[PDB]
Symmetry: C3
Subunit: 313 residues, 3 copies
Amino acid sequence: RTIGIIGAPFSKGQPRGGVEEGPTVLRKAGLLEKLKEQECDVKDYGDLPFADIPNDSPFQIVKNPRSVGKASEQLAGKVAEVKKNGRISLVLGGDHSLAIGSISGHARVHPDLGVIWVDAHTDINTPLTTTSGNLHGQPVSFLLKELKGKIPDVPGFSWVTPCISAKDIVYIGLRDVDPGEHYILKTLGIKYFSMTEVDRLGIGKVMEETLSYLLGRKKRPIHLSFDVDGLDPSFTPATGTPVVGGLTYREGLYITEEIYKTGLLSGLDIMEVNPSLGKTPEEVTRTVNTAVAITLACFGLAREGNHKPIDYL
Amino acid sequence: RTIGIIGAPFSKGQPRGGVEEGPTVLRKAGLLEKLKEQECDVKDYGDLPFADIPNDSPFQIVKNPRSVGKASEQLAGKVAEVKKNGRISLVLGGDHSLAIGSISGHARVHPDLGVIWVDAHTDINTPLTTTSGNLHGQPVSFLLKELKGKIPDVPGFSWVTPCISAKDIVYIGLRDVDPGEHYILKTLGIKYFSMTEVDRLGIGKVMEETLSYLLGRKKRPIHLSFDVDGLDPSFTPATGTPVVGGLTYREGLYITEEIYKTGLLSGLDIMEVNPSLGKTPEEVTRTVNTAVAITLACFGLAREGNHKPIDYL
Amino acid sequence: RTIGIIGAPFSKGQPRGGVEEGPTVLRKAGLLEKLKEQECDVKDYGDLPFADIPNDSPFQIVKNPRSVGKASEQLAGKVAEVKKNGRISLVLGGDHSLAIGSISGHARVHPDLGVIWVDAHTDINTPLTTTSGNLHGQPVSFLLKELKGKIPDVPGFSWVTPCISAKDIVYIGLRDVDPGEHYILKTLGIKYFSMTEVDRLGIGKVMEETLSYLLGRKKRPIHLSFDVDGLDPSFTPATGTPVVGGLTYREGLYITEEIYKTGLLSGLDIMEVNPSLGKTPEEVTRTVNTAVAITLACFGLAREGNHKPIDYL
Ligand SMILES: N[C@@H](CCCC[NH3+])C(=O)O
Ligand SMILES: N[C@@H](CCCC[NH3+])C(=O)O
Ligand SMILES: N[C@@H](CCCC[NH3+])C(=O)O
Ligand SMILES: [Mn+2]
Ligand SMILES: [Mn+2]
Ligand SMILES: [Mn+2]
Ligand SMILES: [Mn+2]
Ligand SMILES: [Mn+2]
Ligand SMILES: [Mn+2]
């Protein structure tokens, strides 16, 4: 469809820095050209400038709360802009803490959006349940309204307003969920398909239930937050928190091909691609190649082929 | 069943030459002995002699049309021979352009045959829609009757007669289909199961629908044209046009085990094995080992075991 | 649940020796600590002392019958002990010949047990049908009552009493079954899901049918004999008899997560882990890492997460 690309070179949501290079390598792989090579009206809003916030001491256990809170605030406004421009926002990260601004900004122009979260983790720890202190593992806790009250006033997020309900989101691919996170999942009744459910039903039924769950009552704009560590590390090794037994390349593409076909995709996140973590230059291209493949699927690239409304014979 | 092996060391359907070695390595892996190690009456018709055709300038964009047209013509007669001998023709390639002669020759003794095409591609470009000019990506266009009129008189194929309908064939494993090819697929209503449908239904349902589709109305001889690049390159890397996200080793064997059980297998093609393309000697044996495994399945080798009609206790 | 760990450093059921190290590396990977890190009351009964039996000439074709028969006899008593202690026996092997003592000892305190055998092989050759002579490929033949009469008096097993029926066991993952073994399977009507049935139905339906088959008539204690070569060698390479096209890591965990949820697991076997066979130190840790993962699943570790009966918010 009509795309609005925005680069988000941010890494302060976690320890390993090379993730802020994601935009660079994803663009070098020729993402723009590839998109344009389709029914895509592409406008790159460039890379957001994430100014240094030198004085950002931990809030209790939470690290770099201000630079994170700031990076998400800046992105929220940018996403809202591209949406007001009638364009599908494509945010290239950058660590997953940015989802806070991406989804918030999306919910401003489209408060009825539905979220599909592909990840190996649920990223729903609260500033109080997290043990690591890394904000790229808490983005979800800031957006849920039902958790409005368990989120302390962390410096940098006083602009945040929970914008989604526990039932407006579906997780797919989970395989490393903390105890407090699992508790929250069962308590708020969050719909999820861990790797156990994917193995059980098959990726087809999984998506069928997902789209039906989020679009059942009525059609709403869709937001896909794709963490690359959601796929098995044999496909996307250059990422910070890899977990074996992930979604295959095929399941990765099947999810996006299906979402694309809904025609309701309005927001997309490609997160956690960290080139510095590749053990070899091949693991690096293998990660970026895969991250690009999943992106092109979101916008039309089908494995059975594509063709223009013309007579080829 | 009763087999008729024929070697087809041909490569002129494409650029990379080492594919004409397929017969050699497939036999060195001990294919004959393996087959004989079963309920197989094996007769090797040797390797066809593909005489040099030095004067073979391109026909427009089409490369080596005469040597290709000749190689397929020679094979067609050989396959017809082994079939008239009441034997399941097993053609070891060689690039996929040979399918033209294999299927044509098969259709002479068994004009009612049904075709199952396992490949990452549809190989249905016409001399006019192809952009590469490589004939191993156009074999299908010469055999379909509905395309009788969109195929120009290319030097070397005036012996060709479309022998199959758009509904006598089922593709399985597609993941890199050109635009003109996709157009033809939807226009002639060709039945196909790209990697998207395999992921959706599961390999079991896929085959179930395939066999039911081709054998529904009535039982007919079956022709299986297996391109090794149909399977994921992690299993068959030594091939010319590999595409990630392919059929697994297991799905590869499940397809053949199922076809075998139909008891209607009459023609088999093992194509695109190119040893020169192996990055290591292991990728080479890994490709040939896999190509052999799929062949033995076609003739009885079952993963649950096999035993002779005797009392082992 | 409440566990009773027993080390079984035995290798005389086959040729390659490094398998008797299994207990050592599985414990070094910190298995005990991991188990304890759950709702597990763990008591390690140490490693059984498998005294040397220098004079153990082959019985016809059968190798090391006395040391094998002795090792299984010793284990049977140890398993019976831990069971009488109201604990789920967790036997770390060691080659698969030990299953004879593990299952026998289990059947003493729980004669109504049901067996689930995950392996690439059926290990049901008789001292008379085996061609290799290796007892780790015959454990099943000594336990079936219906085969009481086809088992010659092999030195070291006069203590053995067939303790299970042909219908009290279900095989999962088969892909290399001898002819005599296949004959026995079809003759005694043994329920099995080779890799062909897993591909067909999907791992979910497979387990569903398995648990329903063994628990259909009524709930009974379950014995899971897990051979690591059951999983594809890309996950567990450090094992003696690897076969490509195995169960994935995911299917490996799905099987155990499901069994765990039955709540009827009473006996568990982790066999064939041979560190000496790793081609690299990574294949070694990759094998042991995987062998540990499947073990923790058996006792509660779920991929969707876990949490204590408390309020995390
Ligand atoms: N759930 C863990 C890991 C998060 C990884 C995010 N990329 C945490 O809260 O730190
Ligand atoms: N479809 C492409 C690739 C074909 C590859 C065949 N092995 C073409 O027409 O050239
Ligand atoms: N079935 C073969 C192989 C067994 C492998 C056991 N780990 C035999 O009887 O020797
Ligand atoms: Mn993650
Ligand atoms: Mn994430
Ligand atoms: Mn192909
Ligand atoms: Mn082909
Ligand atoms: Mn085995
Ligand atoms: Mn075994």
